[PDB]
Amino acid sequence: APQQINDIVHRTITPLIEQQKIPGMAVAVIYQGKPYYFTWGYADIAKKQPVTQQTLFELGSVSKTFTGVLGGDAIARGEIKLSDPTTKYWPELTAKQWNGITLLHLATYTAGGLPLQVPDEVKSSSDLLRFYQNWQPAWAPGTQRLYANSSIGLFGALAVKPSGLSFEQAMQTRVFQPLKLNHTWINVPPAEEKNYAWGYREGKAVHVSPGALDAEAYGVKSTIEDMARWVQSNLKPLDINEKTLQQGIQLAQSRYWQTGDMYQGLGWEMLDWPVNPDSIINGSDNKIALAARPVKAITPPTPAVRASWVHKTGATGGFGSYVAFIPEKELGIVMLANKNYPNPARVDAAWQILNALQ
Numbered sequence: 001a002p003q004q005i006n007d008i009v010h011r012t013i014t015p016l017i018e019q020q021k022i023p024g025m026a027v028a029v030i031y032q033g034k035p036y037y038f039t040w041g042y043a044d045i046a047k048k049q050p051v052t053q054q055t056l057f058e059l060g061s062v063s064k065t066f067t068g069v070l071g072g073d074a075i076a077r078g079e080i081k082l083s084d085p086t087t088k089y090w091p092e093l094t095a096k097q098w099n100g101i102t103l104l105h106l107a108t109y110t111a112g113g114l115p116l117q118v119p120d121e122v123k124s125s126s127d128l129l130r131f132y133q134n135w136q137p138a139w140a141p142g143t144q145r146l147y148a149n150s151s152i153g154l155f156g157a158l159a160v161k162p163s164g165l166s167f168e169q170a171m172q173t174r175v176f177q178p179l180k181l182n183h184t185w186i187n188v189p190p191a192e193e194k195n196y197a198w199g200y201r202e203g204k205a206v207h208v209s210p211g212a213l214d215a216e217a218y219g220v221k222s223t224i225e226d227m228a229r230w231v232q233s234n235l236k237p238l239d240i241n242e243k244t245l246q247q248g249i250q251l252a253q254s255r256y257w258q259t260g261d262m263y264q265g266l267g268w269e270m271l272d273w274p275v276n277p278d279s280i281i282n283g284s285d286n287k288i289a290l291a292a293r294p295v296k297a298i299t300p301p302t303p304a305v306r307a308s309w310v311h312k313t314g315a316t317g318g319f320g321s322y323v324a325f326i327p328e329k330e331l332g333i334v335m336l337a338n339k340n341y342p343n344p345a346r347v348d349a350a351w352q353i354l355n356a357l358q
């Protein structure tokens with residue numbers, strides 16, 4: 001690889017791994033559109049399996065970028081509109097608080113205080129309907145952002161209803177397959193289990209647990225190669241041959257709401273480039289990222305801005321992921337680790353690498 005990339009990646013990631021005690025890590029840098037890969041450590045400590053370019057990591061909430069693009073693709077297909085009431089696709093949602101809550105609100109965490117997590121007690125479909133029927137908003141729709149699996153996860157489930165496909169089938173046929181993400185999974189098949197890293201939480205090997213709306217909110221697993229290809233696809237949607245998927249990618253990077261210096265897309269979040277690094281670094285800390293914040297509507301949404309830092313953090317109990325890219329520079333990074341280590345350390349490392357290469 002070019003020495004500049006080798007040097008800034010190793011000089012940034014080596015200390016990160018040591019400071020954070022990360023058992024295994026994979027990184028891809030996309031530079032002038034081409035990927036360069038780096039790996040360290042162990043996918044499975046007990047079995048002494050190294051991280052490789054074929055290792056599967058849990059993406060956690062980086063999955064929301066796939067959900068947002070799949071929803072964008074459904075909009076481009078004419079199957080749904082973000083202006084549609086949630087009740088168009090779920091007529092059983094008859095409780096009055098749902099009046100005026102649209103798919104846009106669900107997609108962008110602005111419905112009025114849907115919670116981060118669906119309760120673990122929700123195990124059945126009827127439990128899930130009860131949960132949404134009984135939920136009471138703290139705020140009018142379109143006034144406050146509260147990051148939430150229960151919001152964008154319901155968006156993903158409703159977005160695929162007109163297609164008649166399951167969420168997984170829709171994601172496979174409409175997103176994974178056309179983009180040649182052939183080692184990206186909502187459910188890891190038995191044939192791929194040899195590549196599935198263990199996550200590590202307090203020293204214990206763990207994988208993500210089943211939950212309501214898991215696939216839609218936090219349930220994708222992928223390799224560093226496929227994630228590099230996901231970044232390439234989001235960097236340059238105009239190269240994507242499938243028209244609705246190209247359009248869906250563009251829709252997911254539109255700017256729908258502003259809070260502080262950040263703009264909410266569908267799954268993706270964006271800031272103007274050049275960014276103040278303290279603003280994305282500090283902004284990534286869950287003390288800010290998970291907080292309830294007033295939003296300003298962008299009326300109408302701004303189309304995808306090329307001069308953007310576009311990014312998403314993700315975590316499960318055992319894994320920590322981060323993706324960021326700048327379309328105008330054809331530059332991006334993916335960092336996948338099998339420990340959930342603090343967001344700001346991820347973003348700091350990503351910014352150091354990308355800033356040096358820009």
Ligand SMILES: *[B]([O])([O])[C][N]S(=O)(=O)C1=[C][C]=C(C2=NN=N[N]2)N=[C]1
Binds near residue numbers: 062218
């Ligand atoms: B995303 O920002 O990564 C979602 N984060 S989360 O705190 O809501 C979350 C959901 C599920 C899990 C999980 N780990 N193992 N099983 N489930 N972890 C975090």
